[PDB]
């Protein structure tokens, strides 16, 4: 055959893969964490969006820290040999490096470690995408007018910059997930994933600004944060 290139991930396995959505809305009273109004809008939007990309979507609601860890351990022990990729979406409270279970925190590293190249062999060499809508701290943006590494082939699409709050609208859903689904719907058959996420960065940065009766929280902006350890271009489509 003719000259071949291998600059993009093979996305023509029989299955695109799993899309696990963990949607934590209601938290145990003792934690003091508030209910996350708007998050069901996000979860529904993500389900539809990834359905149209031919992912096998599994929605999970209000998981404890123990249930989150058990779920991701179990998913990492499935046979992903016939799947092109893996997607996990986390919708919760959080802080830098941490996602909230309904009864307490889980280290993000604990979750992602299950999918390391040496620990989930049927996903080795395949893109592993973690989409995280959660705070990463409490800063507010005021704006201005023969071997491969075990950490390779991960992409973390964070809703917000390190150290910062992340914004969620109780009616419309989170700024980031709103924007992410819109850009996937418009561009997934057209653009490489990093370019889609760059459009998401621009949409969040330009089209949203907080409104609050509290001056501390009013007129604030957000920029998401793309963290890529990918080794190839990622297109959700393939050529026949």
């Amino acid at each position: 055959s003719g000259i071949s290139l291998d600059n993009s991930y093979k996305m023509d396995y029989p299955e695109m893969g799993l899309c696990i959505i963990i949607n934590n809305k209601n938290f145990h009273k003792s934690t003091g964490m508030t209910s996350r109004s708007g998050t069901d809008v996000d979860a529904a939007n993500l389900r539809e969006t990834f359905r149209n990309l031919k992912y096998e979507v599994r929605n999970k609601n209000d998981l404890t820290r123990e249930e989150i860890v058990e779920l991701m351990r179990d998913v990492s022990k499935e046979d992903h040999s016939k799947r092109s990729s893996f997607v996990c979406v986390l919708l919760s409270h959080g802080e830098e490096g941490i996602i909230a279970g309904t009864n307490g925190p889980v280290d993000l590293k604990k979750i992602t470690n299950f999918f390391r190249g040496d620990r989930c062999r049927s996903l080795t060499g395949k893109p592993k995408l973690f989409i995280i809508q959660a705070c990463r701290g409490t800063e507010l943006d005021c704006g201005i007018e023969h071997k491969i590494p075990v950490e390779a082939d991960f992409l973390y699409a964070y809703s917000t910059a390190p150290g910062y709050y992340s914004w969620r609208n109780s009616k419309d859903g989170s700024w980031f997930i709103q924007s992410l689904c819109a850009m996937l719907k418009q561009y997934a058959d057209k653009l490489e994933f990093m370019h889609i996420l760059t459009r998401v960065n621009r949409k969040v940065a330009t089209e949203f600004e907080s409104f609050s009766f509290d001056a501390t929280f009013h007129a604030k902006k957000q920029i998401p944060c793309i963290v890529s350890m990918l080794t190839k271009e990622l297109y959700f489509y393939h050529l026949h």
Binding site: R36, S92, A134, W167, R168, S212
Partner: peptide, 4 residues
């Protein structure tokens, strides 16, 4: 608008 609320923070996560």
């Amino acid at each position: 608008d609320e923070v996560d």
